[PDB]
Amino acid sequence: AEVTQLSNGIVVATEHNPSAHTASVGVVFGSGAANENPYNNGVSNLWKNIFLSKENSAVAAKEGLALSSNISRDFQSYIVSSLPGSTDKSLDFLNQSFIQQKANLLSSSNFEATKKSVLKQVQDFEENDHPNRVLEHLHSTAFQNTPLSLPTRGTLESLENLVVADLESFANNHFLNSNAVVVGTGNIKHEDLVNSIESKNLSLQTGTKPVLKKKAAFLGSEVRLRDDTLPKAWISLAVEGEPVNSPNYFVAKLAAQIFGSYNAFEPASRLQGIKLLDNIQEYQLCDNFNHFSLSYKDSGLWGFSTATRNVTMIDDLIHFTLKQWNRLTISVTDTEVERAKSLLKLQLGQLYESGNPVNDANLLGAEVLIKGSKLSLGEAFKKIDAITVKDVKAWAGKRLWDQDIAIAGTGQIEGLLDYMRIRSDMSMMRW
């Protein structure tokens, strides 16, 4: 297992695996939804569905290729997959359809049909997908009036004002050679890829991207979307967390692993070594929860999400969870830290060593764009093993004890108390 970075004008990164049976080749750009403004929000999500449109997918399918695309807050990628003997055809398809010609894809008949399909997807997301849209509303209230607040899909109000000239204006500012990384994963050797690119003279455009002026900033706030005709309540809560390239990046992920995830209907999930589960199962305070530690280029979020049918005891669920977060400053034990070390290593090993080269192409390109290289899994395991109890207590005294929070919620949330009752539970008046 080894990565190889090489620059000749174009940054080329590979990750060779001679045991895999497919190969994957694409390009990742270093702009996401946090490089848009409130008037062209959704222009990245439209460029994805233009690339995945029917006439473009049909040209690829006669060659034997498949297409993927992903939109995030800091990056976006466009990936072609094939059998290991036809990576030259997949690199040709990325040259013709995406680099040279774009007036074929941006015809008026293709643009209006794609815009209709995207507007239906965003409408069905806002009406049916309740856990993921509460987490989207948590980002917009915590980073309000700041580039990290814009949703990755766009809104229905901002998507209908978009024309063809808005997509060409975004492509001239961000789809550049100094913003791009060419990636290759699966069964493909590194020097075979750099000689196929150098046998041509690929270059997107010369110049740099615009520089935004407002930096990300956390603000303690809340947003409530009450809907009494829904059968549950869905709540997210977080503090300000760690960015990428932070010295406390792995300590924050281990602290979330201490409290973990839960499913009340799976019998083995009920037997986990988490002390919070004693209070919750006595009166059945929720159906599921999960803790997270998200990281971006400038900021991050640390907290949990939950879903509940017990709508008269919502205040007991928030109170018991926040009293366990107080113990990370005061009285976290050594056996809880050793359990979280083994489970964080199992979770990280499953994320980076799945058998999908499309997942590996997204992870490799996003990390080379920020850091310039990639940290191996062997070196990440040695940083996790060196964390002590005193590292956890010093991190939680800075980020958790007596700090501001952000709350989002939907459904039957009448039993959720107001902000200052929840804010005062971030300290004990004992220590």
Binding site: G273, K275, D334, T335
Partner: protein, 126 residues
């Protein structure tokens, strides 16, 4: 207050000793006959206080034909007590019917609660 695991540990030590089972076992038979619960139609496991989580677990796991018969013996003993009488002598519990029917369910629930308490307050070593 004293657990049934502790009572069975002391009691099985006496019953294996051939010299201690000649002294204490005749005294225990006179103690039970002077107690008089069998003349009201009760077994000893009907007399155990039930307002605790271990006993509520063991009473849930009892088979339902034995749960119906336990409820009739308790109700008949309350009615005999308020009339200030005893049962007729052909309705008394015999010694070969005074068996510990609830004791294996109690000992199983006590061992599971002890193992959970040891895993929740635990040390490690490298």
């Amino acid at each position: 207050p004293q657990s049934f695991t502790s009572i069975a540990r002391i009691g099985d030590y006496i019953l294996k000793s051939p010299v201690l089972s000649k002294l204490c076992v005749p005294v225990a038979n006179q103690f039970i006959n002077l107690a008089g619960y069998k003349k009201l139609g009760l077994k000893f496991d009907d007399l155990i206080a039930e307002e605790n989580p271990i006993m509520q677990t063991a009473l849930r796991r009892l088979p339902e034909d034995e749960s119906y018969a336990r409820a009739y013996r308790i109700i008949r003993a309350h009615q005999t007590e308020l009339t200030h009488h005893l049962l007729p002598r052909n309705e008394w519990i015999k010694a070969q019917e005074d068996v510990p029917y609830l004791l294996p369910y109690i000992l199983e629930a006590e061992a599971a609660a002890k193992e959970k308490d040891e895993l929740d307050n635990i040390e490690v070593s490298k």
